[PDB]
Amino acid sequence: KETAAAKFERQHMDSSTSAASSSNYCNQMMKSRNLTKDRCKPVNTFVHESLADVQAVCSQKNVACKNGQTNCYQSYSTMSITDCRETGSSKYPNCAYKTTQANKHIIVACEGNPYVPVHFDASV
């Protein structure tokens, strides 16, 4: 198994880079993190912040999750993120993505003890 928290770091954390390196970023990252293993995950966001910074988001601004649950939190400051959105010629198993860099507040769902991020909800 893989814990909720470890899975979040696997699919969303990329601290080794401050931004989206190039157009190549998403094709390599999605594959590396095994996000294009059973299908091409449609969209995925990577956060280039320290892990301590992303975890502190659980004590930040509490907001409603897209699913109606109340365990989502919004970062007070903008973070550096990269959005990976699937393309047209992207055909499984040859998934193709468009790398998109930006700075936005992130919204994550937290849970557990300790209370850690387990799901990425949105970026605004």
CA 103 to chain centre: 13
10 labeled binding residue: yes
The active-site residue, picked from 119, 120, 121, 123, is 119
Is residue 105 part of the annotated active site? The answer reads no
37 labeled binding residue: no
Is residue 119 part of the annotated active site? The answer reads yes
DSSP state of 1: -
- In 9-36, which positions are buried (b, 16+ CB within 10 angstroms) versus exposed (e)? bebbbbeeeeebbeeebbbebbeebebb
41 labeled binding residue: yes
61 labeled binding residue: no
Annotated binding site for substrate: 7, 10, 41-45, 66, 85
- Residue ranges for the binding site? 7, 10, 41-45, 66, 85
Active centre residues (catalytic): 12, 119
